[PDB]
Amino acid sequence: AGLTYSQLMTLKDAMLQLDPNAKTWMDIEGRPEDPVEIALYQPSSGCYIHFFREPTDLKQFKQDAKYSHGIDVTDLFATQPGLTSAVIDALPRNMVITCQGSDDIRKLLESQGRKDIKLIDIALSKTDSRKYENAVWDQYKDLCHMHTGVVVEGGKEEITPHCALMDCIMFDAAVSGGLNTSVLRAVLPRDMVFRTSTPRVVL
């Protein structure tokens, strides 16, 4: 199980475009023991890691889908199992990672054998952290089309779906005074995030 040797080498060569000394946000969707969306974001350089994973616990996923990320589980079948472990293995040693609520990132990293990675815990309230939520989506929505379901928050209220990548961007904007100017560039090749499939032709 996991990535093949040549895949790991391509991933390692890929991870070199990460600046190991720059500020790096990280966030996930899904529980740290069963994540389905992973994102790292370096605002100063614009480099970001973004990929997806099929969940193990389908029951807990449906709750996360209805209260948080709104991802269709069928859109994750094409992801490669083991990408999350391989990427976490490939993060630079003694890296400093920033997050809004460091508890979940810590469990994920520690359970993957990366206790060397230090975490900066930014503690913004749940409305303070999403101040730039609309502005972030308005500029970067083309970077993730995976949040297709209706997300909701006694009484129900429909909300904007949570995206691990958009969270990293809007959290950094909240502590920096606005959106960054650095164009965003993906660290991971697209062929590594999803297995390409030709859609069925309508005859």
Site of interaction with Zn ion (CB under 5 A): 144, 163
**Closest CB to Zn ion among residues 11, 168:** 168
Instruction: Tell me whether residue 27 is annotated as binding.
Output: yes
52, 36 Cβ separation under 8 angstroms:
yes
**Closest CB to Zn ion among residues 163, 188:** 163
Instruction: Tell me whether residue 168 is annotated as binding.
Output: no
**Closest CB to Zn ion among residues 117, 144:** 144
Instruction: Tell me whether residue 153 is annotated as binding.
Output: no
Computed on alpha carbons and rounded to an integer, the radius of gyration of the chain in Å comes to: 17
98, 174 Cβ separation under 8 angstroms:
no
**Closest CB to Zn ion among residues 144, 169:** 144
Instruction: Tell me whether residue 29 is annotated as binding.
Output: yes
Shortest distance, position 188 Cβ to Zn ion, whole Å: 14
* Residue 175 burial (10 A CB sphere; 0-12, 13-18, 19+): middle
Shortest distance, position 186 Cβ to Zn ion, whole Å: 13
Shortest distance, position 143 Cβ to Zn ion, whole Å: 8
Q: Which two tokens stand for residue 182?
A: 């650095």
Sign of the C-alpha dihedral, residues 10, 183, 114, 32?
negative
Which stretches of 40-185 are DSSP H helices? 58-67, 83-90, 102-111, 133-140, 164-176
186, 50 Cβ separation under 8 angstroms:
yes
Instruction: Tell me whether residue 50 is annotated as binding.
Output: no
What's at 81, amino acid-wise? P
Shortest distance, position 93 Cβ to Zn ion, whole Å: 28
| DSSP reduced 3-state for 32 | coil
Instruction: Tell me whether residue 33 is annotated as binding.
Output: no
**Closest CB to Zn ion among residues 93, 145:** 145
Q: What are phi and psi of 186, to 5 degrees?
A: -75, 130
Shortest distance, position 94 Cβ to Zn ion, whole Å: 28
Residues of each annotated binding site for Mn(2+): 27, 29, 167
Which residues are part of a known binding site for Zn(2+)? 37, 144, 147, 163
Residues making up the annotated binding site are 27, 29, 37, 144, 147, 163, 167
